[PDB]
């Protein structure tokens, strides 16, 4: 598969980081 190191890079980014940012930014937009 030759790419093998990718999942360790993405899954945390897409399972945590993005849900961390999209949790913050989507919040700050609820009240303005």
């Amino acid at each position: 598969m030759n790419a093998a190191y990718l999942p360790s890079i993405f899954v945390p980014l897409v399972g945590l980081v993005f849900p961390a940012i999209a949790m913050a930014s989507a919040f700050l937009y609820i009240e303005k």
């Binding site: 190191y5 890079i9 945390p12 980014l13 945590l16 980081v17 961390a20 913050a24």
Partner: protein
């Protein structure tokens, strides 16, 4: 009878309970070192985002990099023999 309608501040019982008056009870020996260590990050969106963008990157970094992984399908993982079903 209570009233004093000229003040609606005392009619609401809104009084802060445990807030004290006393000014700083903290020593100047340790004061002047911290007081200038907090404002290095003072700002709304350019710092909080440093915590998201730059801070959360150790999940990325040490999730991939350091070989401290325990039973992780990432790294150590499968090393034993693979299971085969009954049919194939």
């Amino acid at each position: 009878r209570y009233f004093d309608l000229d003040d609606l501040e005392n009619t609401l019982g809104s009084w802060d309970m445990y807030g004290q008056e006393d000014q700083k009870r903290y020593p100047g020996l340790q004061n002047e070192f911290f007081e200038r260590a907090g404002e290095s990050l003072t700002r709304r969106e350019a710092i909080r985002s440093v915590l998201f963008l730059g801070g959360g990157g150790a999940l990325l970094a040490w999730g991939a990099k350091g070989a401290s992984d325990v039973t992780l399908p990432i790294t150590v993982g499968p090393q034993k023999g693979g299971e085969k079903g009954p049919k194939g």
